[PDB]
């Protein structure tokens, strides 16, 4: 049937990717010793989409785990849900790309991509017929943004007609670590926009706002922050897994939410999001769900969508739920907020209803949006890249590993026009 | 085997009592928040709809998801329609059959003469009236 191959890269990906194998684990009720408990059919019906049988009844995930240092690899197999992965799918790096994109993509990644791509072929071609690949990585980092973006290029060269759906945490807007952000972001975007079918962006300063203002958690851990982004990352691929009333897939989302093949950087939100003491109090309704969903404070993208227009948008609801208030409230929002939506695609809204909600709640929604308020990242990363390149700051490591200054001009130009061609449709 | 009420002693109902009426299963558990407001409205509907006819036309079978015999008894003491004994296995088979988890409760299922499901209405939120007594006449 359909399978999604889940390929992990970097420390940030691998800490995020651990939570995918926690939230999909208990949604499908797989036991981290391997077996199944939860005694219902509807989880076990469509489980080859993320797991594999192992002739002992245990379910090994179809996950590919690459990094250039073993420290995060130790953290994966030691924690909870750690015995699930196959050790052969653990591929190591010894040296570590010290947040240098050059050795991430040219020097150290050169003698490991031949090994990690061999492992992908065994999982990919080993099935009947595959749907797509999904990637989790960073853009500031070296081992994630280097070998990750190298892998997208080398896997499109074998499977050009399948879909790519990738999370990439961008550089922070206000204050960011790892001072080579723009040399690791700009040099990875211009190969991301030519090889990735769909990428939807996550900001650590965006999740700081959400967990503090909405979740009201005084002490947010990355364990909590990765859980929140992993909650949405179940929701975009959930309707593959469970039967529903208006079924949608990623290709459903891909044909509909990307008008032109340039602009496919999306926004992510999630509702409901109320604190521990408010699950007892709020009236869980679709009308309050859609109000929470069209808020900048819900968004996992550190941007203000009210400064631009939502070109195309889509909300994937989950749960036993009436379809009027799905349809008529998407009507209502599109008719109240006029200037917040583009004119020449009327009724911009895609709605999809899946019957089985995530555990703990009864109704949930996952929201995506291709917005032209995503200019604020590409401008912020460009002029930071522009100012830090006008007098050749930190070039001599990228040039030291085998680049040239000419690839840096094109990486600016390939992303400079991306700023204008969002401005063209605003 | 299934119980109707009488003050002072408990009397079992006839199997031929249900002739020509429509039987709705009513699920409730005591102390639950929604059950405390579903009980009085269906009480009033029972009284009004079924006690204008010289022939009674509806019947409501009470099934409790309670954790205590005394609590079930003290809520039976408020329930004016018919119910079932706690120690009997019919309640357990009926709840394991009609797909009722232990927030779906409270809910109502009108059935037919064969006992299979004829109509489902829940109360998660004027919806008691959606059932018509003219639907499930029995022979």
């Amino acid at each position: 049937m359909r399978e999604i191959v889940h390929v992990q890269g970097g420390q940030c990906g691998n800490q995020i990717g651990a939570k995918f194998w926690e939230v999909i684990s208990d949604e499908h009720g797989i036991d981290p010793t391997g077996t199944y408990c939860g005694d219902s059919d509807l989880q076990l019906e469509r489980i080859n989409v993320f797991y594999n049988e192992a002739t002992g009844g245990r379910f090994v995930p179809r996950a590919i785990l690459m990094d250039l240092e073993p420290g995060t690899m130790d953290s994966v197999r030691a924690g909870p849900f750690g015995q699930l992965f196959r050790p052969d799918n653990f591929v190591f790096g010894q040296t570590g790309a010290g947040n240098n994109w050059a050795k991430g993509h040219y020097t150290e990644g050169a003698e490991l991509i031949d090994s990690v791509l061999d492992v992908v072929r065994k999982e990919a071609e080993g099935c009947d017929c595959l749907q797509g690949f999904q990637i989790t990585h960073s853009l500031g980092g070296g081992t994630g943004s280097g070998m990750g973006t190298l892998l997208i290029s080398k896997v499109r060269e074998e499977y050009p007609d399948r879909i790519m759906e990738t999370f990439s945490v961008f550089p922070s807007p206000k204050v960011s670590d790892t001072v080579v952000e723009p040399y690791n972001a700009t040099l990875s975007v211009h190969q991301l926009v030519e090889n990735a079918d769909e990428v939807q962006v996550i900001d650590n300063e965006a999740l700081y706002d959400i967990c503090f203002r909405t979740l009201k958690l005084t002490t947010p851990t990355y364990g909590d922050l990765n859980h929140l982004v992993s909650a949405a990352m179940s929701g975009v691929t959930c309707c593959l897994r469970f039967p529903g009333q208006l079924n949608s897939d990623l290709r459903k989302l891909a044909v509909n939410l990307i008008p032109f093949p340039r602009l496919h950087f999306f926004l992510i939100g999630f509702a409901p999001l109320t604190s521990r003491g408010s699950q007892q109090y709020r009236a869980l309704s679709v009308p309050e769900l859609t109000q929470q969903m069209f808020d900048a404070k819900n968004m996992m993208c550190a941007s203000d969508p009210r400064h631009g227009r939502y070109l195309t948008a889509s909300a994937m609801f989950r749960g036993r739920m009436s379809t009027k208030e799905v349809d008529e409230q998407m009507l209502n929002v599109q008719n109240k907020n006029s200037s917040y939506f583009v004119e020449w695609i009327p009724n911009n809204m895609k709605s999809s209803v899946c019957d089985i909600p995530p555990k703990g709640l009864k109704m949930s929604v996952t929201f995506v949006g291709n917005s032209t308020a995503i200019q604020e990242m590409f401008k912020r990363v460009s002029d930071q890249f522009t100012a830090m390149f006008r007098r050749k700051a930190f070039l001599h490591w990228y040039t030291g590993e085998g680049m040239d200054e000419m690839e840096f001009t094109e990486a600016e130009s390939n992303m400079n026009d991306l700023v204008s061609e969002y401005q063209q449709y605003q | 085997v299934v119980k109707r009420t009488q003050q002072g002693n408990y009397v079992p109902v006839r199997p031929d009592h249900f002739a020509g009426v429509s039987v709705a299963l009513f699920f409730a558990k005591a102390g639950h928040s929604k059950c405390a407001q579903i009980v009085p409205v269906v009480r009033q509907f029972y009284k009004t709809t079924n006690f204008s006819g010289e022939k009674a036309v509806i019947e409501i079978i009470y099934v409790s998801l309670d954790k205590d015999e005394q609590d079930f008894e003290r809520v039976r003491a408020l329930m004016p329609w018919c119910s079932v004994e706690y120690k009997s296995c019919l309640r357990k088979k009926l709840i394991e059959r009609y797909r009722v988890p232990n927030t779906a409760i409270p809910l109502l299922i009108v059935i037919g003469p064969n006992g299979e499901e004829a109509g489902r209405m829940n109360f998660q939120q004027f919806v008691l009236q959606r059932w018509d007594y003219r639907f499930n006449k029995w022979p």
Binding site: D26, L42, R320, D355, K359 | A104, N114, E116
Partner: peptide, 22 residues
């Protein structure tokens, strides 16, 4: 802590065996 599964699909919830007419 684990959590039980308490949901169903629309077709399986409603398209049940139904009473045959007289």
């Amino acid at each position: 802590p684990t959590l039980p599964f308490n949901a169903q699909s629309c077709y399986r919830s409603e398209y049940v065996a139904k009473p045959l007419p007289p």
